[PDB]
Amino acid sequence: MKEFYLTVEQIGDSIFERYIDSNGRERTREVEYKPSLFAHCPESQATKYFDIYGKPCTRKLFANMRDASQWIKRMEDIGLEALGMDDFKLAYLSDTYNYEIKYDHTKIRVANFDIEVTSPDGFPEPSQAKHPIDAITHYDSIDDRFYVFDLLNSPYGNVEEWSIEIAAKLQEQGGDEVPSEIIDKIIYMPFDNEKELLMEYLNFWQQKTPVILTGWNVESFAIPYVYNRIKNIFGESTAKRLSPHRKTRVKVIENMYGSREIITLFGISVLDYIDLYKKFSFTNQPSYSLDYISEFELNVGKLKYDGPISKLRESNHQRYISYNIIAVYRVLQIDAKRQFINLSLDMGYYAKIQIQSVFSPIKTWDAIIFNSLKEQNKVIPQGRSHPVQPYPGAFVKEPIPNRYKYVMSFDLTSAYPSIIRQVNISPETIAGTFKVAPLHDYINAVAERPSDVYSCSPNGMMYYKDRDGVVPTEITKVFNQRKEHKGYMLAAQRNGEIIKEALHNPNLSVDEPLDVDYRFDFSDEIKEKIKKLSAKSLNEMLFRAQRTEVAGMTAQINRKALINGLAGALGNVWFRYYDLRNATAITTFGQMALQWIERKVNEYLNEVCGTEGEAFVLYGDTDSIYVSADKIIDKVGESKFRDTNHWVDFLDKFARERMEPAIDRGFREMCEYMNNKQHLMFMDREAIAGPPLGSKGIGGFWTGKKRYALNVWDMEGTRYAEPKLKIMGLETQKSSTPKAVQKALKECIRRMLQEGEESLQEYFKEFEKEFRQLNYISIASVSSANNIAKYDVGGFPGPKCPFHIRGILTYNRAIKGNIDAPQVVEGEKVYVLPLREGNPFGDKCIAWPSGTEITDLIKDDVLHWMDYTVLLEKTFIKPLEGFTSAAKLDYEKKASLFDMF
DNA sequence: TCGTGTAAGCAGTCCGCG
DNA sequence: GCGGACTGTTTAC
Ligand SMILES: [Ca+2]
Ligand SMILES: [Ca+2]
Ligand SMILES: [Ca+2]
Ligand SMILES: [Ca+2]
Ligand SMILES: [Ca+2]
Numbered sequence: 001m002k003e004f005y006l007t008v009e010q011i012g013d014s015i016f017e018r019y020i021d022s023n024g025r026e027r028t029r030e031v032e033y034k035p036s037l038f039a040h041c042p043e044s045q046a047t048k049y050f051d052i053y054g055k056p057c058t059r060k061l062f063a064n065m066r067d068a069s070q071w072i073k074r075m076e077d078i079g080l081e082a083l084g085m086d087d088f089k090l091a092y093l094s095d096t097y098n099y100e101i102k103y104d105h106t107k108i109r110v111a112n113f114d115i116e117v118t119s120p121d122g123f124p125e126p127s128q129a130k131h132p133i134d135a136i137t138h139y140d141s142i143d144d145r146f147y148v149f150d151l152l153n154s155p156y157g158n159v160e161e162w163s164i165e166i167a168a169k170l171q172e173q174g175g176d177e178v179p180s181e182i183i184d185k186i187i188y189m190p191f192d193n194e195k196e197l198l199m200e201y202l203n204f205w206q207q208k209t210p211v212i213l214t215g216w217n218v219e220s221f222a223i224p225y226v227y228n229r230i231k232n233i234f235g236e237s238t239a240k241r242l243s244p245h246r247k248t249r250v251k252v253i254e255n256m257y258g259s260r261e262i263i264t265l266f267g268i269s270v271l272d273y274i275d276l277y278k279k280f281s282f283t284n285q286p287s288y289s290l291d292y293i294s295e296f297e298l299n300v301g302k303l304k305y306d307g308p309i310s311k312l313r314e315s316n317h318q319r320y321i322s323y324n325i326i327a328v329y330r331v332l333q334i335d336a337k338r339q340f341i342n343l344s345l346d347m348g349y350y351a352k353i354q355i356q357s358v359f360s361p362i363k364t365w366d367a368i369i370f371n372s373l374k375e376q377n378k379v380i381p382q383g384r385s386h387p388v389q390p391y392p393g394a395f396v397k398e399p400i401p402n403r404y405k406y407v408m409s410f411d412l413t414s415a416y417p418s419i420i421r422q423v424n425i426s427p428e429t430i431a432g433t434f435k436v437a438p439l440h441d442y443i444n445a446v447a448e449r450p451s452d453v454y455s456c457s458p459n460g461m462m463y464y465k466d467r468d469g470v471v472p473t474e475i476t477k478v479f480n481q482r483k484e485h486k487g488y489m490l491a492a493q494r495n496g497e498i499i500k501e502a503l504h505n506p507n508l509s510v511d512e513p514l515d516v517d518y519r520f521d522f523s524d525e526i527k528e529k530i531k532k533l534s535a536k537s538l539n540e541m542l543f544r545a546q547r548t549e550v551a552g553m554t555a556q557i558n559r560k561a562l563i564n565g566l567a568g569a570l571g572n573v574w575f576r577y578y579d580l581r582n583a584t585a586i587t588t589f590g591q592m593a594l595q596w597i598e599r600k601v602n603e604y605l606n607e608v609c610g611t612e613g614e615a616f617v618l619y620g621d622t623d624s625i626y627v628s629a630d631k632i633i634d635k636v637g638e639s640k641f642r643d644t645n646h647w648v649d650f651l652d653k654f655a656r657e658r659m660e661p662a663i664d665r666g667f668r669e670m671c672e673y674m675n676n677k678q679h680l681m682f683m684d685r686e687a688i689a690g691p692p693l694g695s696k697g698i699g700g701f702w703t704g705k706k707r708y709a710l711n712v713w714d715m716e717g718t719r720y721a722e723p724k725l726k727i728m729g730l731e732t733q734k735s736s737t738p739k740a741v742q743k744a745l746k747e748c749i750r751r752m753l754q755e756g757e758e759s760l761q762e763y764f765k766e767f768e769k770e771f772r773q774l775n776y777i778s779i780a781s782v783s784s785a786n787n788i789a790k791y792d793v794g795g796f797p798g799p800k801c802p803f804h805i806r807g808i809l810t811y812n813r814a815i816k817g818n819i820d821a822p823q824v825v826e827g828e829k830v831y832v833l834p835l836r837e838g839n840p841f842g843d844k845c846i847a848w849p850s851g852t853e854i855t856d857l858i859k860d861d862v863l864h865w866m867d868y869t870v871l872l873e874k875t876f877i878k879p880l881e882g883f884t885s886a887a888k889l890d891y892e893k894k895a896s897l898f899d900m901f
Numbered sequence: 902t903c904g905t906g907t908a909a910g911c912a913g914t915c916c917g918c919g
Numbered sequence: 920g921c922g923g924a925c926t927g928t929t930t931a932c
Contacts, residue, residue, distance in 0.1 A: 253903055262903095279904080284929070359904045393907030394932065415932090416906090561905090564932095568905030575905080583906075622908085622932045706910055706931050728931060729910060736912090736929070783912095784928065786902080802927060803913055827902055874912080910930075917923090 004103045005096070006211045008089045008354060009245060009266045013064040015092045016245045018211065018267055020107045028244065028267075033092050035068045036061050038083035038379045039075075048377045052428035052470070057083060057379045083379045085370050093352045094371050101349040110141035110341060111210035114327045115222050116320065118156045118313045121819045126224035127261060132156070132194045133229055134313060135321055136201060137328045140208050146328060147204065148188045149197050150321055157314035161190050162321040171304075176322035182329055198230055202241050209244045212269050212341065212355060216290045216331055219262050219272040227263045243267055257787055258826060269355040273331050276340040279359060280558050284735045286782040286829060287851025294330045297337060303327075310820055337547060339554050346555075347562065361565035362575050365474075369577070372474050381427075386573035391580050394622035395591040396705050397598070401886040403698040404618055404626075406633050407689040407710055408655050410663065411624035412593070413682045414482070414560065416567035417475050419589050422671065422680040424455050426469020427577045436460040439588070443595040445673065455676040457585035458592045465677050471577070475563050482559035488519035489552025493718050495522050496545040498530060499538055500721040506535035513540045518548035593670065593681060594620050600666030601625060601659070608658070609635070619702060624686070627659070633690075644693040644723075648713040655685040687726055688714040696756030703730070703886040711753035725750060731879040735829075740771075740778040741875045748880060748891075757889050764880070764891045771876075772868050779871060780831040782850050788826050797843075807832045807847025814841050814858050821855050824848065834874075839865035 006018040006026070015031045038049060041058040049057040062068040065088050075082040085091040116135035117124045124131050134156075136149040150162055168183050169175025178186075191197040215222055227248065231239035240246045247266035252259050274288060285293065291302045303323050305312055313320045335341050347364065348355035352371055357363040370380050412418060419425070434450040441447035442458045454462035463469070468476075495518050511534050516526055530538070569575040571583035598617045605616040609631050619626040629651055641647045660683070667681040689710035691697035700710040707729035713720060725746065731737040732746045744767050751759040771779070783804040791801040795813050808824050815821035824830055829850035835841060840861055848854045854862055884891045 251903095255902055258902095275904085278902090357904090361905050363904085365905090391907080396908060396932085411932095565905040568907090571906050587907075624932080704910070706908080729929095731911090733931095734911085734929065781912095784902080786927075800914055800926065804927085879911095906932105908930105908932080910928105912926105912928085914926080915924090918921095 001104065002099070002102055003097070004101050004349065005093060006108065007267050007269055008093060009247070010065060010089050011245060011247055011266065013066055015089060016267055017092070017096075018244065020104070024104070024107055026107070026109075031092070033065065033088065033095075034061055034063060035065055035088045035091055036084060037068055037071065037086070040081065040083075049379050050377070051083060051379050051381065052373065081382045083382055085380060086382070087366075090353065090367050090370065094374055097352060101352070103345060103349050105342070105345060106142075108141070108211050108345070109208065110212045110214065111138060111208075112141075112328050112331055113138040113213070113215050113218065113222060114324060114331075115225060116313070116324050117225060118154070118310065120156065120310055123823060124225065126221055126228060129225050129229035129232055133198065133226065134194075135324045136197075136226075137325045138201075138204075139328050139332060143208070145185050145187050146182060146325055148186060148321065148325060149201055150188065150190045151194055151197050152190050153193055157317075159313065159317040162188060162318055164188065166318055167322045167325075176319055176326075178322050178325060179329065182325075186325065195233060198233065201226075202230070202238070205242060206244075210268055212271055212345075213265075214271050214273050214276070214331065214341065216327070217272060217274050219270055219275070220260065223265070223270065224261065224263050255827075257790070271341065271344055271356060271358075273334070273340070275359065276344065277334070277338075280340045280343060280554060281338065282557060286735045286739070286831075288829075289851040290327060290330060292851040293334065297334050298330070300330070300333075308820055337550055339551055343554055343558055347558075361562055362569050362572060364562065365566050365569055366576050368474050369470055372470055380576065383574075383576045386578055388573055389580060391571060391584050391587070392591075393587050395594055395620075396622070397594075397617075397620045398705060399619040399702040399708070401701075401703050403701045403887040403889070404628055404630075405690060405699040406629035406651070407618075407687070407700050408627045408629050408651055408659070409624060409686040409689070409710075410627070410655075410659070410683045411686050413684060414479055414563065415590060415593075415623035416586050417479050417563040418680040418682070419586050419593070420475055420567060421472045421479075422455075422676045422678055423457050423585065423589060423674070424463040424465065424469055424472055424677040425457070425461075425582050425585050426463070426471040427579060427582070429463040429467075429469035429472075430581065431462045431464050433460045434462055439592060439595075442592050442673075443599065445596075445669075449673060449675070451675050453675075456674045457589040458674070459581075459584045459588035461581050461585040463677070465675075468677075471566065475566055478559055478563050482556050482563065485552055485555035485559065489549055489556050490716060490718065491521050492518040492545050492549035492552055496542065496549060497718060497721050498522055498527065499542045499545060502530045502533065503535060503538050503542070504721075505531070506538055507532050509534050511537050513537045513544065516541075518545045519552065589674075590623060593667070594623060594625070596670050597663060597666055597681075597683065598625060601627060601663065604659075604662040604666075605631075619708070621706065623683075625683075629654075629690075638693070641693055644690075644713065645719075647690070647693060648688055648719070651688045651690075652685070652714055655688070660685065684716070686716060687712045689726070692723065692754055695754060696758070697754040698752055698756070698887055698889070700753060701883065701887040703882050705729075709749050709753060709883075711750075723754065725753065730883070731875070736782050737879075738779045738781055738871075738875055740774045744771075744876060745879060745883075749883065752883070752887060752889065760884075760889070760891060761893050767876070768872070771872060776833065776863055776866060777831065777853070779868075779875075780833050781871075781875060782829055782831055783847075784827070785824060785830045785847070786827055788824070803845060804830060804832050804847055806843060807845040810835075810841050810843045810846045811848050814846070815855065818857070821857065822849050822852060833862065834867040834870040835862075835865045836867045836870075841865070 003022055004020055009016045015033045018028045021027050036059050038057040038059055041056050047056050049059055051057055072082045114137055115133055117131050118134050119131045132154045134151040134154055137146055139146045152159055167176045167178040171177045227239045240248050243265040244267040249264040251262050251264045294300050305319055307315055344355055344358045347358050351364045351367040353367045373380055431454045437447040450456040451462050455465050456462050514529055567586050601617050606614050616627050617625045618628050663683045668679055671679040689700050689712045691699040702708040709727045712724050712726045727733055732742045751763055788808055791798045791805045797806045797809055830847040831850045832847045834845050880891055
């Protein structure tokens with residue numbers, strides 16, 4: 001095999017590198033890497049090294065890495081640019097793995113771990129680590145074993161060994177229901193005392209040193225607790241054995257208000273799954289507890305126990321230990337599904353960065369562009385300081401709030417990355433400027449043509465056309481990767497809908513699921529077999545199709561996120577290629593593109609409908625248009641359609657064979673007008689939306705910008721078995737809206753769009769009648785809670801105190817002098833409920849940590865003083881009034897003359 | 902919430918508006 | 920009672 005790195009570190013003048021050698025063995029080595037940096041030099045001087053603008057450079061080879069750094073300082077002191085990769089370990093990887101890395105994940109040690117720590121006096125601070133570590137479960141990816149380190153004796157209780165036989169049994173037999181598929185992979189080690197546990201743990205760690213280290217809040221809790229606990233018992237030298245190079249650094253994480261500390265372990269790549277999840281999942285959740293995310297991702301029941309976690313070990317050590325092991329498995333099950341670890345290795349190895357740098361698109365792209373330029377003996381510029389400056393972004397059209405019956409939407413494929421490619425936007429492709437006219441002149445094609453030589457953006461920038469810049473070139477490579485995976489994602493989704501259809505007529509038989517690749521559209525032979533399967537088989541196949549789809553989604557969307565990130569990075573001062581001329585060239589060209597194409601689509605449709613000045617494009621945002629298709633449908637007449645799917649076929653055909661050609665001609669002209677390098681504005685039909693044929697549903701509605709709902713039948717060529725609501729901005733989509741409210745609002749919207757006003761009124765009336773019975777958590781609002789100290793004035797609210805913060809302050813007074821009451825955590829989410837007049841808590845709201853039950857001390861009182869009227873009015877009726885007025889519709893029946901009978 | 906960007910919605914506070 | 924100015928927050932792209 002080809003060799004590939006695992007981890008890399010600079011330590012003084014040495015690179016420390018852990019790698020897989022040519023026989024597949026893990027190795028470590030210390031290299032006294034002599035880095036090279038660069039300086040401009042005269043034209044008379046012969047060299048093969050040039051900067052990105054074509055000016056000659058001399059390479060300067062240093063005796064060692066500190067010399068290179070001292071040189072950089074001195075070049076600033078002199079006031080001259082010091083060129084080249086100043087992150088020396090990235091240059092080391094480029095020199096050492098000067099080819100496309102083919103990695104083999106089965107050789108990479110991925111460690112999932114979780115610890116337990118019993119604490120009577122509140123939350124155990126990782127920086128103090130004053131309490132014993134009484135459980136560690138550490139799963140190893142190479143051994144495929146869960147190693148359990150169980151403390152039997154501590155100051156807080158002596159306990160018996162955990163029993164794997166009881167762990168395996170059903171909850172209903174008084175067992176812990178530890179999944180049978182992992183029971184045999186458990187290797188359990190009890191310990192007389194903590195020192196022995198820890199020492200054995202460190203010995204194990206040295207034998208099985210993690211390359212990738214993950215878990216749930218391992219970076220903010222587990223890793224620092226273990227490091228500081230060991231440090232306090234045995235001293236620093238011993239705690240540092242968690243690093244395979246014996247180097248660790250207390251690293252302080254800063255934000256706008258406050259800071260915390262983490263322990264950087266040199267030669268380990270820490271990928272905390274909570275952060276993997278926040279970056280790669282594209283969800284915004286009301287809670288990030290493991291039980292909550294587990295429930296959401298896997299539909300696994302919350303892990304149940306009695307009494308506080310501070311008493312669980314002494315009351316039920318059996319369950320204590322089992323739940324520690326299930327906690328580790330849950331993360332592994334989430335990864336099996338989401339595949340973020342797999343995604344992280346792909347991007348990190350593609351870029352030639354430390355794997356943990358996948359969290360920084362700046363670092364990721366700095367490494368990709370560096371490696372790309374180095375292949376041509378080109379030398380990257382020095383990073384400079386820049387002051388943060390605001391700059392303009394996308395155009396969003398003001399919609400006329402209304403119902404809209406038949407809608408077809410279109411939007412640009414990978415808009416900003418395509419803009420970059422089409423225009424050739426790159427630091428080294430800037431050719432100059434031209435005198436700009438107001439944007440509306442370009443939009444309406446009355447402005448003078450910017451250039452007959454260079455490719456232009458309407459912000460005034462001109463770019464070369466003789467060659468692709470490094471940014472277009474590298475963004476294209478990742479875009480193509482993205483497109484591939486999205487194809488798989490969409491095929492699995494289409495395959496998904498075939499199985500749902502078949503499930504309308506499951507066969508009474510015993511059989512098995514077909515072994516197939518869900519990333520490719522099912523052949524006819526597969527379609528035939530499917531129609532003969534049992535519901536059990538079809539269902540297992542569906543689950544599998546959706547897993548394939550999720551796998552595809554992770555691969556495609558985060559590649560999109562990365563390429564969109566590069567466009568964004570051009571506007572971040574820390575980016576080596578920061579330049580508001582290029583960031584703004586992107587955004588401004590997008591504004592033109594959308595408004596230009598709005599004009600063309602309107603012109604085109606007015607022509608086919610024999611009209612003038614009529615607006616068919618009702619809305620658009622950044623790179624999308626929404627076309628009212630009422631008149632197209634009416635031109636054939638609603639009577640002429642067999643069923644819903646028949647008019648959906650007709651619009652699909654119309655979009656494909658009429659609209660997209662018109663759109664493409666419109667953009668081809670724009671390309672030529674802007675003299676761009678290449679036509680890459682591809683506006684594919686997104687959604688086909690409308691009411692069920694012959695129903696009283698309104699099909700869709702807008703309330704305003706970034707707020708609308710569509711009843712969709714076809715999405716990017718996926719024909720649904722059942723219609724599906726696309727909803728954006730509305731309260732059903734926000735993590736702040738109570739869970740039960742999201743659900744009820746969504747059903748109101750479904751009835752509105754599919755069934756009509758009357759259906760809506762029937763549901764409204766019932767929801768108002770019964771909502772008081774809803775579980776308090778299900779009807780609580782949710783908010784992030786920042787700056788709790790700034791508004792805290794003697795435990796009471798200061799001036800301008802946000803509502804949710806008021807709730808927290810109410811909570812804190814209600815639980816004061818209580819060591820085991822859950823504390824609200826600064827910067828994390830809280831549930832919020834309004835309180836009726838004259839309640840015990842002496843205020844109008846109360847808030848507690850989200851994803852949890854409110855402590856039993858005050859629960860009964862909160863339930864009793866809960867203000868259901870205020871709650872209903874703010875979270876449900878207000879939004880619904882918004883939806884309904886916009887749609888010109890009544891949620892309560894108005895009086896008529898028939899009332900007289 | 903350490904980690905690419907801007908546009909824009911909404912809830913709430915404070916307070917004007919004769 | 921509703922809006923503008925402002926803070927805090929949370930999406931849509
Ligand atoms: Ca735990
Ligand atoms: Ca798009
Ligand atoms: Ca069948
Ligand atoms: Ca879009
Ligand atoms: Ca598309």
